[PDB]
Symmetry: D3
Subunit: 135 residues, 6 copies
């Protein structure tokens, strides 16, 4: 089966300047129906196709896939190659993780954090999805 959530925060953009991972509003999968199933696995893709980060010390952004128990399943990020980008551009980002649905976890969600004091931004379509299969 497929589980999927998307956002498209054009009218009210998202941002963070947190050094620690915080939730991206709306980018959460409800896996309730599949909880406590030791024979199922989720293959999870976080798709942030159009982020950017503002700042003046080689800015960038980090993303993670995290369970509701705080288990970080995967992480990665983008950064620019100049200390002060002229106009920080859009650096497409995708991240893939897996999770055994044996546990009571009912939500798998996206988080983000900054780097070197940046502010990370999302103002357009992004998604999180999973394919759930028998082991």
């Amino acid at each position: 089966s497929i589980v999927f959530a998307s956002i498209d925060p054009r009218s009210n953009p998202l941002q963070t300047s947190s050094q620690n991972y915080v939730d991206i509003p709306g980018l959460k999968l409800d896996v309730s129906k599949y909880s406590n199933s030791p024979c199922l696995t989720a293959l999870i893709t976080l798709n942030i196709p159009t982020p950017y980060a503002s700042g003046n010390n080689f800015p960038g952004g980090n993303f993670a896939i995290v369970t509701d128990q705080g288990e970080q399943l995967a992480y990665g990020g983008f950064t620019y190659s100049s200390k002060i980008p002229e106009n920080s551009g859009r650096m497409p980002f995708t991240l893939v993780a897996r999770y055994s649905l044996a546990s009571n976890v009912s939500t798998i969600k996206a988080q983000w954090s900054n780097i070197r004091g940046s502010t990370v931004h999302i103002d357009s379509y992004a998604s999180i999805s999973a394919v759930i299969q028998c082991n």
Copy 2:
């Protein structure tokens, strides 16, 4: 099940300077066999791993996944951080969408468009794919 299509236009590269989304030829999924199936869902991934864009006003490129009915399921894009890039580099791009196959849609395809008067280019492998599953 899996549906899949790819291109590799090395010998005849693709380009667009269209401000409006237009088809990327060859990046189309035929989901005819699954149309009119309210119990099926497609999870669609557009993979353009090596695009670039030329131009002199912070060039970049936009991509979308669209149905044959004109439904835009997903969109996004890349851009450079310099007004006039020294040599516009390759900025990998992936986009993930979903579609309920309840409708009569028979084609799910990739589109592209420019930004700020750029020209977008593909000269190498790219793909569009879907996983089709029963809703439960």
Copy 3:
């Protein structure tokens, strides 16, 4: 079904300055159990979310998904837009391939190579994965 392999080489980072595609160690899928099956297909995703490349001639890195017979199923790469990047940044990379499991193939793996004498680097989480399906959905 799902097949999955990840690496996270923080403590011992990986690098290559190979102009030819070479294996990324640890990013290999065993599909032996599914070989010689007209009836199955694999959708393979290589996810290198945080690579970079060092160099002074528009550096970058290339990646491929390949079979154990050396067949290149997919390829692509990233490059910087400056000749000598001030500090080569992280350029997320994903690649998607398909393989009919009709043949006698046993492994699907990731490879990488450099460009214009660069050195490509991975020092953090990366994965390769596949969804394997029957061509008939029942």
Copy 4:
């Protein structure tokens, strides 16, 4: 997926002389996990391999597969050919039904009833089972 329940009432045999269908205790399937799923169907098999019936007017027994909401999905039965059987023999019985899981039904279960005043008996292995599949 498979759902299954069995009984083996050797020490405490089961019997009914009920003219109306009543439950066979223990031959019930919990399908709660699948309720409200318009894209799932259950194929249900009731297997009573060794029943008999006693009585004096062409005895026999009837069986049904029913939901918790009282819907009878299938029915059938066995009877003897003689008015008062010399010694009521074992007459194997199987019944197959189908049920869409679109509704809120939580239980699919077996029932039995008599015919012409008989008493129906089970004193050994019997089962109810279902295969649950996506419609597509």
Copy 5:
């Protein structure tokens, strides 16, 4: 997937006195969508829980599962143990077959025939069903 058909011919009971197999109307499965599919197999169950047969020479009935291309996949039947049953009773009957869906088969259906000049009867619920699966479980 599941394919299923049932009848319940209470008002207009079905009967046959034919020694050769003839179709039981209404007990047919459309497998058109699955045909020409070497990767798929059907497991077919014919359930006739309440038949009887009338006659005066050890009556009974036979049933088969067959394809639209004339192929007999399974057969069997019931008979009574008395030459002239006092009142021919109900003798439950089930039959299970398998079929590869590699061929251009459109339909899998039930047939019946008599024995020793009997008349076979169905006047209540009966069904034919199949579970269709990939030969590979992924």
Copy 6:
């Protein structure tokens, strides 16, 4: 997936006069590729549509589904309603069992036995089959 075996012993009919269960040759399922799999379950149907039994003390026959590791999963049987049947009629028989494939089970198979000194006979089509599924459907 589906596993299936059938026999059609017209030319050399099978019989048993054994009070103890013995294997019915040819009615065995190989589940070895699915064994040691706690996430898989088999639903097993034994279909003997046309058996009979000879004898003079209320004859009949018993059938069981069993594993190679001596587990009797299901059993049942038919009997006639007369001490000395005028002519041993055909009494259709089906039996359905379940098995978790978590164990090192290699085989699931049919057995038969007599009752009260009878001889049980099979001279036509019979089958044993299983549907194998993951415990959780997706």
